[PDB]
Write a protein that binds this ligand. Sequence first.
Ligand SMILES: NC(=O)C1=CN([C@@H]2O[C@H](COP(=O)(O)OP(=O)(O)OC[C@H]3O[C@@H](n4cnc5c(N)ncnc54)[C@H](OP(=O)(O)O)[C@@H]3O)[C@@H](O)[C@H]2O)C=CC1
Ligand SMILES: NC(=O)C1=CN([C@@H]2O[C@H](COP(=O)(O)OP(=O)(O)OC[C@H]3O[C@@H](n4cnc5c(N)ncnc54)[C@H](OP(=O)(O)O)[C@@H]3O)[C@@H](O)[C@H]2O)C=CC1
Lengths: 310, 310
Amino acid sequence: QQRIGVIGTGAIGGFYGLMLAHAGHDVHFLLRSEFEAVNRAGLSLNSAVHGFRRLAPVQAYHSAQDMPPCDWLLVGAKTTGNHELAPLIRAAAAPGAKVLLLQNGLGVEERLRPLLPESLHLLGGLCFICVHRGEPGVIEHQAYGGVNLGYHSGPADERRRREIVEEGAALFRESGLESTAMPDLEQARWQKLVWNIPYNGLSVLLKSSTAPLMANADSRSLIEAIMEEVIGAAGACGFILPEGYADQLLAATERMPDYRPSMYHDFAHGRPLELAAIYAAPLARAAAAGYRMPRVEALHQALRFLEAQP
Amino acid sequence: QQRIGVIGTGAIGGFYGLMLAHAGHDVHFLLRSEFEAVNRAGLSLNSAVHGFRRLAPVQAYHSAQDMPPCDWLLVGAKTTGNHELAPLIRAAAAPGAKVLLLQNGLGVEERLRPLLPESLHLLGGLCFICVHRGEPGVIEHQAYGGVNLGYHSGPADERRRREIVEEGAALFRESGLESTAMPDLEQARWQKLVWNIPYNGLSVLLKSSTAPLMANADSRSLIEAIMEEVIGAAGACGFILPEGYADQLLAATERMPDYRPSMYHDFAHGRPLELAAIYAAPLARAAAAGYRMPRVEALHQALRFLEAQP
Ligand SMILES: NC(=O)C1=CN([C@@H]2O[C@H](COP(=O)(O)OP(=O)(O)OC[C@H]3O[C@@H](n4cnc5c(N)ncnc54)[C@H](OP(=O)(O)O)[C@@H]3O)[C@@H](O)[C@H]2O)C=CC1
Ligand SMILES: NC(=O)C1=CN([C@@H]2O[C@H](COP(=O)(O)OP(=O)(O)OC[C@H]3O[C@@H](n4cnc5c(N)ncnc54)[C@H](OP(=O)(O)O)[C@@H]3O)[C@@H](O)[C@H]2O)C=CC1
């Protein structure tokens, strides 16, 4: 039994902490705005995959300093707050703890590493899941749920790194989730950008969920074009992605239920968009490699304009 | 004294017909939805350039067949209706009349020519003007007003074509407007696309007038990038545009008052956008020349998506 801490208990943190808790793990949740309702009424899950689940009472905390030392810390905050998140991770971390970022974007682990003791293992958890927060304390899970883990940095040698990635994957596997050990976390993060770059921004820019974006031929063509820019940028930075990856990803999105990306909810609620990790970072990597992404560049500009307007 | 007919009496047709009428010309206005208010109360102009002007009574018509034969026909409809407009132009045209399209876009004259008798002179009038309709019968003119004329097709040889272009320019010059005879109408239309392609679409896509688009650094950079695509496409199709044209156009737009492009009003009022002439036509010309315009292509796709959404 690992002791798990969830740092940022939103849609992602709530889902994975609840799943792990349901599987017999000792899970401790750090909450912010919704601490009162969850501490009181608990956490509940509507899921088309796993059915209804409820955790009550919850081991809930409003301050990381109150949390006991945890062996695995699942970071479910958005990447926008990661700098301010580091002191909270450090406080809840047992010695040699594993820090696992359940976060989208590129360069996420690298930008956090200077704020974590080198004695902590820092891993990335790429989650392929359609989930959002409903009413407070209620998690709305529409599809998928798998987590692909990769190792960024920490005191482990290569052999130990693979063992630790497998330990994390086993945690999620024991809970009834799909989990995969990745050999190359950066490659995996580039792969995931092919979906998140078009769908997250375009859902805000065109105020639309996934199904209308796929059903209209102009947005569908635009999504495919953006995917090829991300695929081309990844290759230019030394990360070749599979043949016909765009067609595959587009097909999976057709099969997907009508879904509002996380960025859609952020703009709806006036929360800052994860532009830095999802757009700014791969655009910077692309320019360093001499590869231009005109549609992605323009999307990022449009989203920045939208965030500045009254 | 030329007899002038205005076919489509909106912001552009109202302005130029009124200006010409104020200068002593015999002007006859074809109106549609606003015929009742203008036939009754007349046409009035608030202008920061020319001050207030009013034409009352107006020679107003709801049917082109009622109009007398006109020597010059000023077409102020949007380009979306040009196919349906041709029988109206033919009816109001005196023998050998001059048809002058006060319309944005590319290939406008070419697409109309098959529907006009070869005995009519078909010219393009590129209007550089900030104008929109206010209340019915009221024209809101914020800045500029100049018209650059070019000859597309008709029974005139080169010498005669230049003479006729100069005759048109003189009409507007006599009315107190800036007017220029252009040697190459297609070149002039490509030039004008450099402004209309970014500003018309982006004002709809980002729901913004010109001043916020210029004041935000991300949209300003995006506008400049789009301009270079249009400039590059024009060159690829054999129409070299001047050095530093983008910087000049951007500077003029800074000097410009806060302006909502015509396309902004169209989307606000549920009217179809002039996508075919402003985006589809130059994109097709570019692809024929082997030159891709990724930002313009994506903007057109986004605007088409927006027009299809409920
Ligand atoms: N298929 C995919 O690609 C998916 C990936 N994601 C990604 O996962 C990450 C999180 O997404 P998501 O769960 O949907 O976002 P949410 O807003 O739903 O949850 C984020 C949680 O982190 C909390 N948080 C931030 N800072 C703190 C802090 N100091 N202390 C306590 N709590 C904090 C927030 O609290 P508070 O509510 O008070 O603000 C919030 O509850 C993102 O990077 C997202 O892109 C998300 C969904 C699907
Ligand atoms: N600086 C620039 O680039 C500028 C250029 N333009 C361009 O000029 C052209 C017209 O623009 P604008 O005046 O602003 O648009 P408006 O909508 O204001 O006016 C168009 C007029 O044409 C009328 N119309 C269309 N079909 C008919 C018909 N069968 N019979 C009678 N009337 C008809 C419309 O009548 P109804 O009202 O009933 O629909 C309308 O009054 C466009 O191509 C536009 O892009 C416009 C402004 C600035």
